[PDB]
């Protein structure tokens, strides 16, 4: 006789796993994370995330963190905003961490729900609609700090060269850096000079993030950089993504999580489309452009497959792209990306895909 059992772990190794955050915007109270094997497209499991969930995997690979909103009776009753901790291998719920009822409700940009490099603190965006950054102590399971200094700023860019530091983009066109103490409270902060003109050359929030610097692209196809090799962030730019031929056909960037950086080479990947004008900044990619950030020149361009969001795995030299429903897997070990496969129907309405961390 056969017996149906539970309690099983995900059938593929962690290193094969990707996480497709399905907003299910048509039924946004039943958002979820779908877990796939990128090597063969196999569906491995899922984590339910209620209304407009956000997701990330712990930097040590052991846990999945979600952020979501519940109400006692969904459309009425008391609001509970939470972070949940889930086991990554069993895909089971472990802990709920209470948040104040102002966690950001919005599309799944990476920078709304992040963690410190050392993995000890979750760092999340609030909007009430006044903005602040919330800090959750993972070990304690507690919300421990509300960074009001970040009012008028938006999104979280962790610094991979420091254990508990991150930056945010402010309304003055500069960056605010926050360095947390080992208690999760603000230990120090600094403000850069103006990096970009908010009015004249607004940037996309998505960073192309290196170990000690970050690059940002603009609505008009310029590039700005923030170097955080020191305690004070040094800013520069613009340089243009575009040559004269590109400008004649009005090429500009477009998408959501629209850039990535391959750290070993310095290659930056950007979704681009022609006939750019006011209102096209979220258009699907006609092409992916591959930029050498050292020479400030394009090295390659390939078809974009209408992608809107991407992510990069450094150690296996991979790029995923996502068009809302389908995930493309690329090999980026060489300057021209090579398409390996497409996973069809990975989501109904996803703008974010992430690899399982392997770097520890």
């Amino acid at each position: 006789r056969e017996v149906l059992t539970g309690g099983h772990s995900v059938s593929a190794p962690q290193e094969n796993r990707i996480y497709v955050m399905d907003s299910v915007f048509m039924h946004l109270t039943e958002s979820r994370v779908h877990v796939y094997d990128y090597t063969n497209g196999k569906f491995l499991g899922m984590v339910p995330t209620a209304f407009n969930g956000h997701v990330q995997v712990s930097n040590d690979g052991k846990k999945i963190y979600t952020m979501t909103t519940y109400h006692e009776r969904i459309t009425r009753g008391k609001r509970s905003d939470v972070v949940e901790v889930w086991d990554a291998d069993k895909l089971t719920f472990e802990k709920e961490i209470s948040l104040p009822p102002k966690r950001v409700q919005g599309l799944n940009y990476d920078g709304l729900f992040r963690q410190t490099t050392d993995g000890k603190f979750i760092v999340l965006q609030n909007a009430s609609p006044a903005t602040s950054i919330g800090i959750v102590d993972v070990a304690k399971g507690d919300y421990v700090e509300d960074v009001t200094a970040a009012a008028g700023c938006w999104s979280v860019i962790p610094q991979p060269n420091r254990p508990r530091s991150f930056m945010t983009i402010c309304g003055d066109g500069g960056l605010l850096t926050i360095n947390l103490g080992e208690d999760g409270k603000v230990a120090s902060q600094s403000r850069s000079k103006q990096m970009f003109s908010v009015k004249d050359d607004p940037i996309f929030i998505a960073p192309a993030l290196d170990k000690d610097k970050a690059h940002f692209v603009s609505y008009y196809g310029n590039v700005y950089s923030a170097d955080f090799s020191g305690d004070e962030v040094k800013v520069d730019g613009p340089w243009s993504l575009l040559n004269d031929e590109d400008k004649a056909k009005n090429w500009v960037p477009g998408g959501y999580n629209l850039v990535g950086l391959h750290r070993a080479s310095g290659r930056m990947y950007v979704f681009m489309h022609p006939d750019g004008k006011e209102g096209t900044h979220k258009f699907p990619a006609a092409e992916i452009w591959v930029m050498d950030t050292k020479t400030k020149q394009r090295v390659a361009r390939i078809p974009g497959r209408d992608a809107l969001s991407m992510t990069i795995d450094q150690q296996r030299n991979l790029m995923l792209t996502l068009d809302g429903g389908n995930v493309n897997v690329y090999d980026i070990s060489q300057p021209e990306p090579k398409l390996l496969r497409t996973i069809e129907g990975a989501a109904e309405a996803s703008l974010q895909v992430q690899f399982h961390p392997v770097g520890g």
Partner: protein, 122 residues
Amino acid sequence: HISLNPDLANEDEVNSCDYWRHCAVDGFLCSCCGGTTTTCPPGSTPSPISWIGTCHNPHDGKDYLISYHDCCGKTACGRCQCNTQTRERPGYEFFLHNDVNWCMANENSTFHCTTSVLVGLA
């Protein structure tokens, strides 16, 4: 002045993402969801806060200030989804930004539908 008064216009024109005043709309149009351009569908509540912007009216040649409110407290309407982005900016210009839920401060933040409310000449 039909171009300013959606209730006097053709429904097909008003329920379209190309209607001039819907120029920075992200979500399901309330006028397709049992409401109208300026009334929430029954049992859903207006957002007290919104993203804003201006839209050009090609019919009278003038520019108008628009307030993009949501209706809240019911699950997704599902009809007439728009994603227009004219002059829309990221979250560091927060009240010009439309990738967030402008129901976020309502008694119930569940997003039902959205619309474009005409404030005045720009």
